[PDB]
Structure formats: C-alpha cells, structure tokens
Design a protein around this ligand. Sequence first.
Ligand SMILES: Nc1ncnc2c1ncn2[C@@H]1O[C@H](COP(=O)(O)OP(=O)(O)OP(=O)(O)O)[C@@H](O)[C@H]1O
Ligand SMILES: Nc1ncnc2c1ncn2[C@@H]1O[C@H](COP(=O)(O)OP(=O)(O)OP(=O)(O)O)[C@@H](O)[C@H]1O
Ligand SMILES: Nc1ncnc2c1ncn2[C@@H]1O[C@H](COP(=O)(O)OP(=O)(O)OP(=O)(O)O)[C@@H](O)[C@H]1O
Ligand SMILES: Nc1ncnc2c1ncn2[C@@H]1O[C@H](COP(=O)(O)OP(=O)(O)OP(=O)(O)O)[C@@H](O)[C@H]1O
Ligand SMILES: Nc1ncnc2c1ncn2[C@@H]1O[C@H](COP(=O)(O)OP(=O)(O)OP(=O)(O)O)[C@@H](O)[C@H]1O
Ligand SMILES: Nc1ncnc2c1ncn2[C@@H]1O[C@H](COP(=O)(O)OP(=O)(O)OP(=O)(O)O)[C@@H](O)[C@H]1O
Lengths: 277, 277, 277, 275, 277, 277
Amino acid sequence: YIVQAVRGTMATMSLDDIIGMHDVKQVLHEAVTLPLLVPEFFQGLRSPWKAMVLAGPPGTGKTLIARAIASESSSTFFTVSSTDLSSKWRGDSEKIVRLLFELARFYAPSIIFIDQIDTHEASRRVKSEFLVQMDRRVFVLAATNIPWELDEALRRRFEKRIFIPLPDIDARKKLIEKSMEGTPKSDEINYDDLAARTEGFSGADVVSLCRTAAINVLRRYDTKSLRGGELTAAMESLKAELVRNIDFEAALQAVSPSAGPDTMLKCKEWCDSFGAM
Amino acid sequence: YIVQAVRGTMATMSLDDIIGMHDVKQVLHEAVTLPLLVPEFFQGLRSPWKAMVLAGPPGTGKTLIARAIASESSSTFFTVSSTDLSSKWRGDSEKIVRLLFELARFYAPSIIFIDQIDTHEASRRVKSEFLVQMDRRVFVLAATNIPWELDEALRRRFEKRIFIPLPDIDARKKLIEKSMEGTPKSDEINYDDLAARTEGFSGADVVSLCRTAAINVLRRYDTKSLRGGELTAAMESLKAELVRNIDFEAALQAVSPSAGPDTMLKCKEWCDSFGAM
Amino acid sequence: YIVQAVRGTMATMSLDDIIGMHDVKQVLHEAVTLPLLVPEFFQGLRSPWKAMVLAGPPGTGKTLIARAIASESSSTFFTVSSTDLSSKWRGDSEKIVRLLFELARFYAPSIIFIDQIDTHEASRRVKSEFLVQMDRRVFVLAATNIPWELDEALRRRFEKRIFIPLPDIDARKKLIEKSMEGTPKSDEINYDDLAARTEGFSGADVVSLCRTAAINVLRRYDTKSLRGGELTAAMESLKAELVRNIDFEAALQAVSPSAGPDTMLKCKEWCDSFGAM
Amino acid sequence: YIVQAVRGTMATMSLDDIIGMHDVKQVLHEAVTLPLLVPEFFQGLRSPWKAMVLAGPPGTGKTLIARAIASESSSTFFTVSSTDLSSKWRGDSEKIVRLLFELARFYAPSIIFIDQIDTHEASRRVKSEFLVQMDRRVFVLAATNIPWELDEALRRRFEKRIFIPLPDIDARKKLIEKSMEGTPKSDEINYDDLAARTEGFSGADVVSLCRTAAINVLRRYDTKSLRGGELTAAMESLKAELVRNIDFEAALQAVSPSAGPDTMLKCKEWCDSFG
Amino acid sequence: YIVQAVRGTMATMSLDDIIGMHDVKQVLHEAVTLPLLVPEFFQGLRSPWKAMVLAGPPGTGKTLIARAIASESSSTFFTVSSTDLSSKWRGDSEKIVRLLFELARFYAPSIIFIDQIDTHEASRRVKSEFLVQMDRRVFVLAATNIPWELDEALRRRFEKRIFIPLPDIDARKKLIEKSMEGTPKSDEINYDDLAARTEGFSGADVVSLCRTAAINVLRRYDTKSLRGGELTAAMESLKAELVRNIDFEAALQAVSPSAGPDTMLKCKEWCDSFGAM
Amino acid sequence: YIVQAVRGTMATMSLDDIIGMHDVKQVLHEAVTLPLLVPEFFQGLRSPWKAMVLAGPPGTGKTLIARAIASESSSTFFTVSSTDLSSKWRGDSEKIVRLLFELARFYAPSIIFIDQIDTHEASRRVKSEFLVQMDRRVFVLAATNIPWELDEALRRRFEKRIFIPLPDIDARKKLIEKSMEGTPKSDEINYDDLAARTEGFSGADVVSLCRTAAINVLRRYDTKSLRGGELTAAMESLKAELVRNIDFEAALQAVSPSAGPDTMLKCKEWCDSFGAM
Ligand SMILES: Nc1ncnc2c1ncn2[C@@H]1O[C@H](COP(=O)(O)OP(=O)(O)OP(=O)(O)O)[C@@H](O)[C@H]1O
Ligand SMILES: Nc1ncnc2c1ncn2[C@@H]1O[C@H](COP(=O)(O)OP(=O)(O)OP(=O)(O)O)[C@@H](O)[C@H]1O
Ligand SMILES: Nc1ncnc2c1ncn2[C@@H]1O[C@H](COP(=O)(O)OP(=O)(O)OP(=O)(O)O)[C@@H](O)[C@H]1O
Ligand SMILES: Nc1ncnc2c1ncn2[C@@H]1O[C@H](COP(=O)(O)OP(=O)(O)OP(=O)(O)O)[C@@H](O)[C@H]1O
Ligand SMILES: Nc1ncnc2c1ncn2[C@@H]1O[C@H](COP(=O)(O)OP(=O)(O)OP(=O)(O)O)[C@@H](O)[C@H]1O
Ligand SMILES: Nc1ncnc2c1ncn2[C@@H]1O[C@H](COP(=O)(O)OP(=O)(O)OP(=O)(O)O)[C@@H](O)[C@H]1O
C-alpha cells in the first residue's frame, strides 16, 4: 500500500572500536551472535535475550553503537525513529507495525535499532499494537535519555534494562590515545595530567576536545587572515604540523562539559530499584 | 472484500501448567467444557457466562493462558488487535464486527481473546457497535493494565471482571520448579530461601531470573574466547554444566522487579471498589 | 441498490415480565396500541406522540426491553445500530435514511429501536437529513447512557425525553423474585436484608448475582473433582438441589456494582435540568 | 439522465393561524403575490429580495412555515436536502445543480427551501457551482440554527439574515388560543397567568405542553384496565370530557425546554455581527 | 503534497558590517569557506563544526548575522520558523524535518538558522526527530535568549555554545564610528564621552540612539511647522545641519536601556557552568 | 482557510480632539505622516520608527486615541485582540500572524494596534512567531496597563516605551472644557475650583462625570414623573437647562475615581527606571 516508508528504514566499519561496557558487549556477543553460530543451543530456557534497553546521558555511546553493530552483523537490519507518523489521509499507522514485525520475521534473522522511545490517542494505539507483535531468531533494541517515563509496562518487555556511566577516567585515557590515532601530535603529551581535568565529560566532549586542539593549532597561525585565498605551502603542510599539551590546555580552560549531573544521578538511582539488569 | 483480515484472526501447551487463579481455572472448568458435557443444565438463568475481563500488572500470564486454551479446546479461536482500522477510502470499520460475530456464530460455538482495551469519534463507532453484538454459545475474555480507563459500561457487560495479584512466596517456588523442567541443576537449591529474595516479583521476573541463572554459567567463562568458536568440551558440556547457588546469586543481585506497586494497589483497590468477581 | 442491508435491519417473548416503569408502560399502552384500537380519538392535537428518547444508567433493560416490546405487538419493527457507513465508492449514506422512512411509512405504522445515539462532515449529513426525515402513524425509541451530549435539537423533536432511576427495595424484591422464575430455593429466605444489601446495583447486576448463585452450588461441590469426564448423579441432582442463603452470601461479599454513580447524578440532574418529561 | 431525484423534489392549513413576526409576513405578502400582480413596483431596485437568510433555535416554525406557504402559494416548489451527493460511478454531482436551476427557470417562477445548510473537494464543487446558479422571477429560501458556522459570506449574498427569538408571552397566549381549538374546556383558565410560567420556551414547547394536558384527560382514567377494549362511555366522552387547569398542571410541573438558551443567546449576537 | 512551505523558507549587505567578536567570525572562516576551498584539511578528525549555538539578549545582532551571512555565502540558506505548523487534517509535522535535512543533503553544502530554539507531546515529536537527523559538509546554526532552558541534551549536539558578552566599549567606539556614516556631523564629538554614559546598552540601543539624535535635529523645529504642507529647503538641508552634542544630549537623557543586566549576568553564570565554548 | 478572523479584524472622530502628551502627538505625527509627505528623508538611519508601547491606567485614552488615528490615518488599519484562539482542529494559530504581516505588506502601508499585550506553551508560541515577523512603510503599536511585567526582549523591540500619566490640573481644566463640548452651562460654575478637587479621575472618569452632572440635571427635576409616557416640560428642557454647580455637585459626590494610581505610580517609576523614552 504505502510501505515505501519502511523501505527507507533499511540498510545492509568495525565492532570493537568501543571502550567500555564489557558486560553489554558480552551479552550482545551472547544473545545475538552465538545463536546465529550455534542455533542448536539457544531454545526456550536457553533462548536468546529477546530485547533490552540502553539508558544513559547524551553522548554516552547509545546512538553510537548501532552503526558498528549492523556494520558488523551479517543479518538484515532496520533503523527506526518516532516517525512512523500518522495522517488523516492514512487514518492509521499501526498496520505499519504489523508489516514491520511480519516483515522482520519474513527476513527472519533481523534486528532493530530505535531511538527517542518516549514517543493522547495514537500513542496508546501504536503502544498497543507494538505488543502482540513484540510477543526464527530476532532481537530488538531501545534507547533513551529520560526513561523515567517508560510510559507503563515495557519495564518487563525489554528483559534487561541497563544504565551506562558518564565514563571513568582510565577509559578516557583509552578514548583519547585511541582518538588521536593517525593524527600528528608531539609525543611529549602525558594523558594522566590531561585525564585528571576530564572530570564530568563524556565521549562527545572528549572527541570534541581532540577536534578543539586540531583546530587550535590552526588558531595559533594566520587563521583569520588569508593566503590570498590560496593554500600556502605551509597550509598544505599542516598535515605535517603537530599538536601539543598547550593546544588542549586552551580548550580545557575554554570548555565545560556542557551538561549537568543530576539527570545521571537520578536515572542512576532508578537503574537499581525499578531498573532491571 | 477487505474482510480477509478476520481470517488472520484465527489459528490452529497445557492448562495445568499455570499456578494460582483457581478462581478462573474453575470458571473455565465451569462455563466452557461442562456445557459441551452438559448442555441441559446451562440454559436461560443457568446458561453460561457470556464474558468477563481480567485485571493485573504485566507478568501474570493474562496474555498466556489463552494459548493454553487454544491448545486445550477443539473449538475456534479469534485473536484480536486494535488494528481494526479503516481509511478515507474505506471510512468504515464497525462492519468488521458485525461480520465478526456473525462469522463466529455461523462458523462455530466460538471463543474470543483480546488485549489493549483502550478501545475521537471512530472509537465511539466501534464502541457503539460492540455493545449490540456483545448481547449457539459464545464466550469472550479480555485483559488489560488500564482498568480505570474503561470508558463506558463494559464494567457491566462483562458479568465478571477480576484482578489477580502477584503470588505468595511458595507459589513462586512452584513457578521456578515448574521452570526447572528442561533444566539441568544441582540439589543444593533452596527454592524457598530464594523465594524470600523474590520479593515483589511477577512471573516474567521469575522466569527471566532463571534464564539469567542459566546464561550465568556461560558468563562465568570467557565469552570472547574462541577455539574458533568451536564446540569445546565445556561448550559441549553446556547441556551438562549445572546452575547452582552462585549462578542464581548473580541474577539475584543483578535484577530488580522492574515494576512499581502503585498501580498494583490502585487496581487491586478498584477490583473491590467498582470491581466484581 | 446496495440497500439490502436495510432489510437486514428488520424483523416481524412476552411483555409484563418486566417490572416497574408504570410511567413508560403507560406511555406506550397510551400512545401506540390504543391508537390501533381506537384511531377515532387520536387526531391532530390529540394525535399520538411521534417519538421519545430515554436516559438511564446501564443495567436497566433500556437496550433489552424493546426486544420483547416488538415481540409483543404485530406492527413492523426495525433494529438499528449506528451501522450507517459508506465508502469512497459510495460516499453518500444519508440516502439510506431517505429510503428508510419511505420504506417505513410504506409498510405500516412503524416502530424504530435505536441504541447509543450519542452520534466530521458525514455526521452533520446524517444528523441533518434525519431531522427533516423525522417529520401513517410512525413511532421511535432512542436510548443511551451519555445523553449530556444530545447535540442540538433532537431534544425538541423527541417530545418526551425520559430518565429511569435505579430500583428500590420493593421493586427490587419483585425483580429478585422475577429471577426466581421456575428456580429452586430453600425457605430460609428473607428478601428484606437481601434486597437491602443490593443498593448500587441494577437489574442486570441482580441477574448476574442470582445466576452466580445457581452455579454457586457447583462451587460448593468438588468442581476440581471429575466424574471421569462423565455425568454424576449429583450433576443431575442439580435440578433437585435447592438454593440457600449460604449459596448467596459468598456472592454478596464477592461482588460490587462494577459501575459508577456520579453519572447517575449527572443525568439525574439533566433529567429535569433542561430535561423533558 | 439520473434526474429521478430532480423531479422527486417537487410537491403539490392556514396562514393567520401562525402567530408571530408580522414583519416577514409583510415581506412576503409584498414579495410573493404582488410580483404576480404589480411587476412595475417589482423591477430593478424594488424587485423582490431574491434570496433571504434565516437562523433560530428549534421549535419556531422555520421548518414548518414552508409547508404553510406550499399550501398557500400557487407557484412551483422544489424541496431540497443535503442529498446533492453521488458515488464513484458518477464522481461529479455539480451537474445536479446545473440541470436543476435550469429546470427551475424552465418550469415557472418558483421558491425553494432548505433547512440546516451547515453543509472535501465535493463541498468546494457545491459552493462553486451553486454560486454560479445563485442568480425570470426565481426566488430562494434556506435556513439553519447554527450561523456560528455560516459558511463564507452569505449574509452578503442574501438580503436578510433574521433572528427569531423565543416569542413574547402575549402571542404565546395567542398560540394557546390556537392550541385549545376543538376541545371541551372550562372557562376558569387564566391563559396569561399560565403564560407567565411558560417563559423559556419556543412555540413547539407550548404545542407538546398543551397536547400533554390533552392526554392527561385520558390518564385520569384507569389505563391498564380494560373495557373489553371498548370505547367506554367515559372514553367516548373524552370528546366531551373537559380540559381544565388540573390537566394543564401536570404539563406545567413535568416539562422543561429540553435544552438550554446558550445557542439562542449566542446566535442572537450574530444578527448584529454579520447582521 | 502540503509541504511547499519548505521552499518558502528558501531565499537567494557585507560581512565586515559586523563589529568585533573575533571568535565568532573565526569559527566560520575556519568552518565554512576554507572547507570549501580546502576540503582535504577539514575532514574526519579535522571535520568542520557540525553546528554551534549562541546566547545573549536580543539587540546584540544575533538575528542580524544571517542577512549578512547569506548575503555573502556561496551555498544556500534555509530560514526557519517556530511555525512548524500542523492540524488535525495533518496531525504530523515531523515529516517536515526529514524533508528538511533530506533537502539539505539534496541541494548543497548549505546552511540553516533557527531562532527561539526554546520552541506536551508534539514538542517531543519534533524534538525527537530533529536529533538523529542532526547527525557532505553541512552546517546548522542556533540561537536563543533563555539558554537556561535548553531542554534535555542539545547542549551536546551543538558543540560550540557561546555566551556573547554585552557590548564592550572600544567596540562601541567602532559601533558609532560605523553608524556615523552617511551622517553629516560636527567634529566636536568625543565618542568616548558618550561611551561613559552608554553602560547598559545593546548595539541596537546605540544605533537607536544615533537615530534619536538624527531626528532630534528636526525636533528642534516644530512638527506643526509647515511650508504650506510642503518640504522646505531646510528640511532637505537637515543634512546640511550637522549632528551635535545638543542633538545627542536629549536622546542621552531620554533613553533607558530598557533591559536589566542580571539576565546576562545569570546566563553568564551559566556559560561558566555547563557552558560550552 | 480560517483567514476570515484577520479580514474581519479590518474595520473602519478626528485627530485634534485630544488633550495630553503634546510630545506623543508630535512623535506620532513624525513616524506616520511625514514618511508619506516626505518619504525621501526617512531612509537607512533616518527610517521610520517600527513601534513603541504605552503605559497607564485604563480608561485613559489608549483605546479612544486609535479611533481618531484611523479616522485620520489615510493608510489602512488592523484591529487586534489577544484572540489567537486554539482548536484541536487547527491546533496552530500563530500562522495567523505570519499571514498577517504578509497581508499588511501585501495590501499597503498600514497600522497595527493591540490592547493588553500582557498575554504555558502558547505564550512562547505567539511570542516566538511574533519576532521575525516584526523585523513598504509600516508602523505598529501595542499598549497595556500592567507593563511592569513586560518581557525584556519586547522591552527592546518596541523602540520607545512611554507612560501616560493621570491628568494634571491645567489639562484637567482643558479636559472638562473638552468634556463640556456639546453642552450648555451656567456662569456661576468655576471649573478651576473643580480642577482643584478632581484628583484621581482618569479621562473616562471625567467624561462620565460631566455626563453624570448632565443627568444630575434630571435627578433634580421630576425624574419620577409617571406622566403616562409624556415628557415633562423641565424634562424636555434638561439639555436646555444650563448646567450649574448644583448640577455638578451630586455628580462629584456620586462618581468616584475607582482607579489604582499607586501601582500606576510604581510602573511610572519603572517607565524611567529601565523604561525608555
Ligand atoms: N563506550 C564508548 N567507547 C568509545 N567511544 C565512545 C563510547 N561512548 C561514547 N563514545 C564516543 O562519543 C561519541 C558519542 O556519540 P553519540 O551522540 O552516538 O553518543 P550517544 O550518547 O549515543 O548519543 P545519543 O544521546 O543521541 O544516543 C561517539 O562518537 C563515540 O566515539
Ligand atoms: N501463573 C503463571 N504460571 C506460569 N507462567 C507464568 C505465570 N504468570 C506469568 N507467567 C510467565 O510470565 C509471562 C507472562 O506473559 P503475559 O504477557 O501473558 O503476562 P500478562 O500479565 O498477560 O502481561 P500483559 O497482560 O501486560 O501483556 C509468560 O511468559 C509466562 O510464561
Ligand atoms: N426493569 C427490569 N426488569 C427486568 N429485568 C431487567 C430490568 N432492567 C434490566 N433488566 C435485566 O438486565 C439486563 C439489561 O440489559 P440491557 O443492556 O438492555 O440494559 P440497559 O441498561 O438497557 O443497557 P444500555 O445501557 O445499553 O441501555 C437484561 O438482560 C434484563 O434481563
Ligand atoms: N409562529 C408560530 N405559529 C404557530 N405555530 C408555531 C410557530 N412557531 C412554532 N410553531 C409550532 O412549533 C412547531 C415547530 O416547527 P419547526 O420544526 O418548523 O420549528 P423550527 O424552528 O423550524 O425547528 P427546527 O429549526 O429545529 O426545525 C410547529 O409544529 C408549530 O406548530
Ligand atoms: N556586533 C555588531 N556590529 C554591528 N552592529 C550590531 C552588532 N550587534 C548589534 N548590532 C546592531 O543591533 C541591531 C540588533 O539587530 P537584531 O534585531 O538582529 O538583534 P538580535 O540580537 O540579533 O536579536 P535576536 O536575539 O532576536 O537574534 C542590529 O540591527 C545592528 O544594527
Ligand atoms: N488625551 C486625551 N484627550 C482627550 N480625551 C481623552 C484623553 N485620554 C482619555 N480621554 C477620554 O477618556 C475616555 C477613555 O478613553 P479610552 O477608553 O481609550 O481609555 P483606555 O485606557 O484606552 O480604555 P481601555 O484601555 O480600558 O480600553 C474617552 O472618553 C476619551 O475621550
């Protein structure tokens, strides 16, 4: 009928470029891959974990994961938003969900990513029709930044409910030394002195900090001026140009985490009580 | 015509697997089978229950028992969705129901199951036509987690409407020990001492916790290890390796109820106040 | 053309089984049959009443009564839901009614039952043509339970708009005994306190109570027990086995009205506040 | 072609029995027959106001008066409804109006009625061609009760848009003098003091009220009892049996207007704004 | 369909018209033109800024930026309204945004600006679909006045978030010295003498002051001074009359800055606390 | 679609019947007429004023001015209220405004005025959509009576911010004598003695005061004359009866100021303290 909508929701890099969540990495090595490697085991009690949800503050790798996942996974895969939207010319959308899970089972090995799960009448409609399709190997995944409002009952229907940290600091050492790979830099840098000042940041802040130094070395030069509009031989040779501890110093004094803490504190309070594994 | 959707409503497990609800167990011993055995008793006054509904939080088998009914009864069966919609091209979905019940009685002495009783003006169309054909035996059963939201007189036209709570402590042990079928294990396993630590759980909590107790066996070993991912002698000992007190324990500390009791006490108060048997 | 459904709305029990509402049974004894027996009286001013509407909480046989009314008399009758839809192919369904009233004045002094008239452009279409088409001796009967939303003018065009309350302990005694029609019982009964504990209920509620009390004797016997799937001489003795107050009391504690009261207060305000006779 | 509905619109009481608004009665005793008798007055400016507009609450005779004019007039009529519809077989209903007013001019000078023109591409088709056909002595009426949703501008397109209040207690008493015609009735009945309790009513309210006072006469007799179904002495005497203040009393206590005054008050402002 | 408003937002001055804030233009010279002239530098780790965001009270010429930018810029521009309107006929405006970014990648490495970013459920719809779509060199721009109420996460997604200062005073010298162009003035002026009094103004407040002193020349004469209703030669010679400290002083006493400093002080307290660069 | 609200807002005294703020009379002769009689002078820096605001107790001519404005203004006019009314059908009203300014620019040079701009989500909706539309000759205005709470952004975007005071005593003399326009009077009257005693009275206060004495002339004569619908000779000679101090007196002690000058004085502190010219 009008299923070209879901045709746009289709696709077909690496998987261990990520630094953190050895447990989630484990469970997604377990209930996703090994069934497709060992269908004999996973069944009934042995069956794979059907679905989970990922709860964390922004920039904590939630959205970052699925591109790696589906870029590694041989399975079919879909990406979804809250834009399975409605229209009076359609009068309904929940049939799109029947087509969705029926097509997923049609491409039986298939996995989902969806974001902004928080999303009156049609909310209850789609929320309802989601379920009998929610309950041939399949996996489903969630995401959020304010899961205090799983509206009613998906606290069950996604088996595991996971929190992730605003990450710790040796991890940030791995993030930064990994982030400046294939990039010029003076080897004088000490990532402990850097790391100690990284308190409260997250992944996006960190890689944005590497971007901030990479632009800062340009800022030290004839930056707002011109080469006559050209690329000077030194400008072209900026690939050879290096980076130093000062170049991050200016950024650190310049940059805040650009985010609070009490959200992480609250949802951290909820991940234990009324928060599953 | 477009009524092919109703053909999908029909389909082709045991009943005594379920614990608790001796009430409803009895009611389907009463108004389902005994009529087939004893049509003479059931008549007029004594004719069977026309319908009911159910109430409870998720995790209580409301979406489960009916599959055991279908595996039990030789009668017909009718899955139901909220996706009985139409379009600006169609603009008429009440006839779906006028054909539903006529098809039912025409095809068999039939049984209906339904969920998401959320069911603008079209809602009043469907709700309007529902009442007439709601009043040669036929039974209906329904369940929800939105009991307060019954917008109209179906509190009456379901002659019974029942809440079910979370179980007592020992019945949880019976749920586990039932789920210990098809489960290798040791015998140092005090189901009751566990049951003390099962506080505020439901069925899916228990069974999911047992799945955790199983996979934890693997999680004690190196997941990302490989012998080419081959079926190593311990990986052949998957069926041999057991689930012991620790294997539960990590689940016990890794798990929440993943639920809130507020709605539970709410509807469990409504089940006595404006709620019947 | 496609109006064979107009014949599907058609047909051609007993009356005084129903108790109370001497008001209304007087209205129809007056204004329906006696015209057929004595047209000479009725003319112009003294012509019969052309239509009414009803108001009541559910469980009071508004939707039920007209079955036995039409079964009593011999004049024509029309069963009418809100099934008056159309299609993008049709897109014109008010013609249903223009054909309808013509077919009604065609046959005979005609009688319309119609339920849930709480009833978008097509809404104003049908609701418009219905008016002029509402004005040979034809009569109408409406019914609903949320008439607070009588849209505009059907308030007028139905001369009398009637409220019916919940019953009272005398009439309740009569109804209770009208549930005991050809019903066994023991003689330890006093309907005084029994009926006194019925406050909050309706007719159908009491029906569900007594119907529950008959099966309650099975619920005293070993319903978990089996006859080998056969008959039991006690199962045949159920016609012999009487009913008792003990076979009621458990049902009494086990049951609420399963309904509200503030709606009764609301329409019982509108029963006179802008409330026709 | 498919014009069975066209000729189906055709059709073939008193006038002073109507009690209220001698203004429009003046407008039409002017603008109905003197068009037939004095076209020199009715030409150019002082020609009949070729269309008008109306709106009021229910029970004021808007829907009733056109029948009175039908039995009064001699010209031709076209009953009209919201049944300018069609199906995907046709998919084009505006040809209806094209053949229609052609038929109107073809047959005779004529007068049209419709109630509740509250009445989607086909809507734009209707309001498109209907205006083209909206303008050799042909004349119009439409009416409604909700000019809050008066479609586009038609108080512009129509000379007059009249409000018709819940009428005055006096002429209501005159409507009581219309009600009791053909009735055995005492003369101890103060129709005006009774009219005092009426306030908050339309005409039809008074009609059904006095009718319920009429049936009350029967209701004083044993209803569920039988004379063998016979027209009893007293039952035959219903044609002789009085109607009295007691018979009005049950009507007075029993009846409400069946609906409020908010719509009447709301649209009462519309005859000023876009008036 | 019904989304021609997108084209309406499209459209087709100088760039040193703006005075000060070397940081701001540095971000854009770095991030906009030089990528177009030097793509091979700006890429991957060195990729241009995906999007920034801004702050400060109005009258600081934030909105005044974009007419200059798209007056200069090569790639196209996309205006934005908070009127991402909708209807019950539509019921969904998020499709406007998929169409928006789709147009963005479709047309060119082009530019967007939104104002009043502060702008229930539909707000979560748009604030949901916006996000993943905000992740081919492309740039987006932001602005507000209450950055304290940047809702949930976009503090992250717009890396550079700047609290501009209030207008500093040497820059005010540049402001007036710019705004005294096409302005016949006396050379008595000490712009610093004015500047001692300007503490509290925006830039627009000061250009408005220049307006005020300009009209003041006329206001020396009567507005009821007529030439038969004509232009006097001196009315065109108001340019021949020079602007003077007399002409300012009335404006200088006359103006209050019409704005409190505690707002800029407050969000200045914010720009140091979770305030990006 | 629903654009009638704007076109309906269009509608159709003299501009020298006013007594108060010779200043504002000048300024609004300057921003309005002379840009039509001398458009050449108004350009760039010299361009006309966009808008301003007003501030005082109500019934102080802020609404009565505008009818002399329009009655004199050769250009066209728009009426405005706070009626940006919402509807679940429409749900997006503020497109009214984007259509509005597009209309005004599309029609001709013109005027806009709203009273009580002091008008949750919809506040920031109308406020947000206002701004860019507020930034082909045009003049615009608003006015309230509690501008102390006016938004800071608005505090700029309306150029001037003006306070109208209650009438001062010589103006009070000119305002009685203006209110005496179209009235015979006696000679014992001393309007200076009245101006000495008429504190608190706004414009409407003095108007309805002089009127209250004009009808005091009736209150002395046979006001209770029930002459069968006839006019008494003195009652006919009321307008002929020369008004006197005896006539003013009972109007003085009848009428009161009944207006809040305290808060008006507080915002009159604000009208210079963070309140512009
Ligand atoms: N555990 C991690 N290991 C390595 N990198 C990480 C990790 N978490 C975050 N990052 C880095 O931080 C960035 C976060 O991007 P992204 O916006 O997807 O985070 P997010 O929290 O998933 O965003 P959203 O809140 O939209 O889901 C990535 O580019 C990634 O390189
Ligand atoms: N009494 C029980 N006996 C055995 N298993 C149970 C019982 N209650 C729940 N379960 C298990 O928990 C799960 C409950 O699923 P189900 O959706 O039927 O519960 P529910 O209460 O219907 O949830 P919802 O009504 O919210 O959909 C099933 O997988 C079932 O195996
Ligand atoms: N006055 C009465 N006398 C005898 N039985 C009654 C009476 N009122 C209700 N009942 C019983 O209760 C049931 C009510 O059915 P029904 O749905 O018609 O009630 P209702 O109140 O008319 O419903 P609705 O709200 O749709 O009008 C009937 O089956 C009938 O036997
Ligand atoms: N002026 C009047 N003179 C005589 N009878 C009247 C008058 N007004 C109303 N009636 C009575 O009231 C009844 C109402 O008729 P009608 O339906 O035309 O009113 P209406 O205002 O058109 O109602 P609606 O507009 O809702 O159709 C008639 O049967 C008539 O006897
Ligand atoms: N840096 C600057 N250089 C030159 N002129 C300026 C500067 N900042 C402000 N102005 C002047 O102030 C005026 C303010 O314009 P504008 O209305 O766009 O304010 P804004 O701060 O952009 O408002 P908003 O907060 O809604 O974006 C400009 O027209 C300009 O004349
Ligand atoms: N400056 C003035 N010159 C002449 N008359 C005035 C002046 N100010 C007020 N008045 C008189 O006072 C009365 C009040 O006018 P108006 O209703 O416009 O005041 P307002 O404050 O705008 O009213 P509101 O704001 O309550 O609608 C008018 O009758 C007007 O003639």
